Design a protein around this ligand. Structure first.
Ligand SMILES: *[C@@H]1O[C@H](CO)[C@@H](O[C@@H]2O[C@H](CO)[C@@H](O)[C@H](O)[C@H]2NC(C)=O)[C@H](O)[C@H]1NC(C)=O
Lengths: 195, 230, 213
C-alpha cells in the first residue's frame, strides 16, 4: 500500500480557492521524500515539523487541501496572515502543524484569451475561521439599501474571477497550492512513514 | 511544427556557471542530435559541442572542453548545456540547433549531415558583477501622421522585449538598439507612427518585459493636450 | 581547425542586382559547406546546404556553387528583405567552424528623414530627471547630423544616438537621439531644439519646443 499523493499533486484540474478541495489520507504508508526532492516546488514551508523527520512519523490522519491562487497571494497561506485569500477564502490556524507547497502553473492554468475558470471571494461580512469553506453566492450588501437578489449600487456578486494569461507578470501568474495537515489525535496511527 | 524553445535571458557574476535549457517539440526527440552554438555581441558564430539525445554521448570543442557539460532529459524532451567558471568573454547568445539525421553509405560508411535546419530563439547570458535592475517606462506622447512611443530607462542587463497592443500593432514600429549610459545601465526607446486621425480613435499601450529583473509594464501612451485643465 | 575566409566582409548593392559572396577554406572540405542568413536579433537561417542544394522554402533566387576549397553564394536579383549577415559553415572535419560573415545592405535613393521631438513626460519629471527625445524616421543615406540646441546654445556630452538597422521593406534607417539632464538643470532653460542636417534636406530642419507649454 501507498498513500495517493500523486492523485493530489499531479491532478489534471484544480479547484478555485473559495471552493478549495480537501482529500483525506488514511490507513496507508506515505513516502514523503518524493515531495521534498522535487526542484519544481516554488514554495515549501513546514510548521511544527521538519520534512527531514516526516518519513519516520505516525499520524491519526492527514489532509491534503488543494487550490489555485495568483502569484503574490501564496504568502497569505501561513499562520497569522491576512488578506482576501486568508480572510475570505482559505484560513490556516495559528497552531497549524503541517506543510504548504506551491508551484507555478502558468503553463497549464493560463490560456491565450485568459483563463476565467478560477475564482475567489472578494467580499464577506466576516472573516473565515480556520479551515472554513464558503461557496455561497448571495449578493454582498455593502450599503443600507438591501439588494433582494439583484446587484447594483453597493450591491455586488461576491465572487470574482482571476484573469490568467501567459503574458502576466510572475505576481499575477497562477500557482497551484497543496496544504498538508497532520492530525495527531489520541487514536491509532493510520498514516505513517516507511521508515 | 518543429519547435526549439530556450530558457530566459540570464546574468551571472564572473566565476559562476549557467545552465541553459533547450526544449524540443514536434518530432521524436531521441532520433536526432543537438548542437550548441555561441554568438558574442557583434561577432560571428562559434560551435561548442554535440549531444546524442538518445544515448547521451557528448563531444565538445577543445576551447570549452572541461568547463562545458551537456545534459539530456528524454522524459521532458529537453537538452541542457552548462558553462562553468564564467567570465566576461563568455557574454553571448546561446542557440541549440537540430541538424537532420546521419545515414550509412552504400559502402557502409557513416556520413554526417550537420547543417542546422532548426534553431532555438537564443539565450542571452551576460557575465558581470553589476546587480540586476528593472527598467522604468515613460511615455513619449504624440504631437498628417503622428509619432508616439515609450522610453525604457536605466535597466540591467539586456534584453527588454517591447510590443504594442500586445503584438496587435506591428507596422511602423521601430524598437531601437539599447545604449549603455555613463551609469552602466541601459536605456531604449520604442516608437511607432500612426495616422493622426487614429490618435483619438485608437488606444496605444506599450508592453515592456524585462525578466532578468522579473519586470513587466503595460504603459498607456496618452496624447498630450495643451488646453485641458481643471 | 579549418578556417573559412569570407569575402567581401561588407557590401552594398541595389534592388534587382546579382550578389556574389565567396568562402574559401583552409583545407579541402569536399562539398560539406552550408550558407546561413542571419537578420539582426534573429537566429541564423539555413539557406544553402552541401554547397549547392536549396533548402525547402527558400526562394529560387539563392544559389550555391563550389567544391574543394573555394565556394560561392549568389543572389539572383536582390530584394529588399535580403539584407542580413550571411555565414558559411563547414562540417567536413570537427570542429564545425563558421566564416567571418558578410554584411549585406541595400543601396537606395536619397530619402529625407521625418523629424519629431518629445519633451520629458511629467511622470519622469517627478523622478528627478528629464529626457528629451528626437526621432528621425525612415531616411537614407544613414549619415545624419543631430544637434541639440538649448536656448540656442549647443549641448555636448549629455546625449546619445541609436540607429535601427536597415528596413526590410523600404530599406531606410531610423535614428534616436536622447538628451538627459537633471530636472534642476532641465528647468534652467526654456527652448529645446533639434536641428537635423541630412543629404535629403535642402536646408537643416529644426524642431523645437518651449519648456512648460
Ligand atoms: C508527480 O509528477 C511526476 C509524474 O511523472 C513525478 O515526477 C518524477 O518523480 C520520479 C520519481 O518518482 C523521478 O524519477 C522523475 O525524475 C520525476 N520527474 C520530474 C519531472 O521531476 C512525481 O514524482 C509525481 N509525484 C506525485 C507525488 O504526484
Amino acid at each position: 500500500n501507498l498513500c495517493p499523493f500523486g492523485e493530489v499533486f499531479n491532478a489534471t484540474r484544480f479547484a478555485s480557492v473559495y471552493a478549495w478541495n480537501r482529500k483525506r489520507i488514511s490507513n496507508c504508508v506515505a513516502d514523503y521524500s518524493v515531495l521534498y526532492n522535487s526542484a519544481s516546488f516554488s514554495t515549501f514551508k513546514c510548521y511544527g515539523v521538519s520534512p527531514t523527520k516526516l518519513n519516520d512519523l505516525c499520524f491519526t490522519n492527514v489532509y491534503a487541501d488543494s487550490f489555485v491562487i495568483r502569484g503574490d497571494e501564496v504568502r497569505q497561506i501561513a499562520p497569522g496572515q491576512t488578506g482576501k485569500i486568508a480572510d475570505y477564502n482559505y484560513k490556516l490556524p495559528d497552531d497549524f502543524t503541517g506543510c504548504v507547497i506551491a508551484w507555478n502553473s502558468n503553463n497549464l492554468d493560463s490560456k491565450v484569451g485568459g483563463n476565467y475558470n478560477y475564482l475567489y471571494r472578494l467580499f464577506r461580512k466576516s472573516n473565515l475561521k480556520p479551515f472554513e469553506r464558503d461557496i455561497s453566492t448571495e449578493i454582498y450588501q455593502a450599503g443600507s439599501t438591501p439588494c433582494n437578489g439583484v446587484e447594483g449600487f453597493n450591491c455586488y456578486f461576491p465572487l470574482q474571477s482571476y484573469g490568467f494569461q501567459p503574458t502576466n507578470g510572475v505576481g499575477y501568474q497562477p500557482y497551484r497550492v497543496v496544504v498538508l495537515s497532520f492530525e495527531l489525535l489520541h487514536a491509532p496511527a493510520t498514516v505513517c512513514g516507511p521508515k | 511544427q518543429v519547435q526549439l524553445v530556450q530558457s530566459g535571458a540570464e546574468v551571472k557574476k564572473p566565476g559562476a556557471s549557467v545552465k541553459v535549457s533547450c526544449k524540443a517539440s514536434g518530432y521524436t526527440f531521441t532520433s536526432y542530435y543537438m548542437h550548441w552554438v555561441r554568438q558574442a555581441p557583434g561577432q560571428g558564430l562559434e560551435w561548442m559541442g554535440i549531444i546524442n539525445s538518445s544515448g547521451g554521448s557528448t563531444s565538445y570543442a577543445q576551447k570549452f572542453q572541461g568547463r562545458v557539460t551537456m545534459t539530456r532529459d528524454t522524459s521532458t524532451s529537453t537538452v541542457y548545456m552548462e558553462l562553468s567558471s564564467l567570465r566576461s568573454e563568455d557574454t553571448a547568445v546561446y542557440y541549440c540547433a537540430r541538424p537532420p539525421r546521419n545515414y550509412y553509405d552504400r559502402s557502409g560508411y557513416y556520413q554526417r549531415a550537420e547543417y542546422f535546419q532548426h534553431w532555438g530563439q537564443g539565450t542571452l547570458v551576460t557575465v558581470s558583477s553589476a546587480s540586476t535592475k528593472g527598467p522604468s517606462v515613460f511615455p513619449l506622447a504624440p504631437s498628417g501622421t503622428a509619432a508616439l512611443g515609450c522610453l525604457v530607462k536605466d535597466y540591467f542587463p539586456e534584453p527588454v522585449t517591447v510590443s504594442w497592443n500586445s503584438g496587435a500593432l506591428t507596422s511602423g514600429v521601430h524598437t531601437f538598439p539599447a545604449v549603455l549610459q555613463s551609469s552602466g545601465l541601459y536605456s531604449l526607446s520604442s516608437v511607432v507612427t500612426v495616422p493622426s486621425s487614429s490618435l483619438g480613435t485608437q488606444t496605444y499601450i506599450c508592453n515592456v518585459n524585462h525578466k532578468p529583473s522579473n519586470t513587466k509594464v503595460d504603459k498607456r501612451v496618452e496624447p498630450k493636450s495643451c488646453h485641458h485643465h481643471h | 581547425d579549418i578556417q573559412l575566409t569570407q569575402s567581401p566582409s561588407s557590401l552594398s548593392a541595389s534592388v534587382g542586382d546579382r550578389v556574389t559572396i565567396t568562402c574559401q577554406a583552409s583545407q579541402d572540405i569536399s562539398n560539406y559547406l552550408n550558407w546561413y542568413q542571419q537578420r539582426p536579433g534573429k537566429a541564423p537561417k539555413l539557406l544553402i546546404y552541401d554547397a549547392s542544394n536549396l533548402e525547402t522554402g527558400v526562394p529560387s533566387r539563392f544559389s550555391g556553387s563550389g567544391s574543394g576549397t573555394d565556394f560561392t553564394f549568389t543572389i539572383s536579383s536582390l530584394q529588399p528583405e535580403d539584407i542580413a549577415t550571411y555565414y558559411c559553415q563547414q562540417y567536413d572535419n570537427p570542429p564545425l567552424t563558421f566564416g567571418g560573415g558578410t554584411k549585406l545592405e541595400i543601396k537606395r535613393t536619397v530619402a529625407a528623414p521625418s523629424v519629431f521631438i518629445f519633451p520629458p513626460s511629467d511622470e519622469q519629471l517627478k523622478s528627478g530627471t528629464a529626457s528629451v527625445v528626437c526621432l528621425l524616421n525612415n531616411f537614407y543615406p544613414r549619415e545624419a547630423k543631430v544637434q541639440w540646441k538649448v536656448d540656442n546654445a549647443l549641448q555636448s556630452g549629455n546625449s546619445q544616438e541609436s540607429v535601427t538597422e536597415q528596413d526590410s521593406k523600404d530599406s531606410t534607417y531610423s535614428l534616436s537621439s536622447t538628451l538627459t539632464l537633471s530636472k534642476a538643470d532641465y528647468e534652467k532653460h526654456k527652448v529645446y531644439a533639434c536641428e537635423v542636417t541630412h543629404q535629403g534636406l535642402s536646408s537643416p530642419v529644426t524642431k523645437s519646443f518651449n519648456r512648460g507649454e
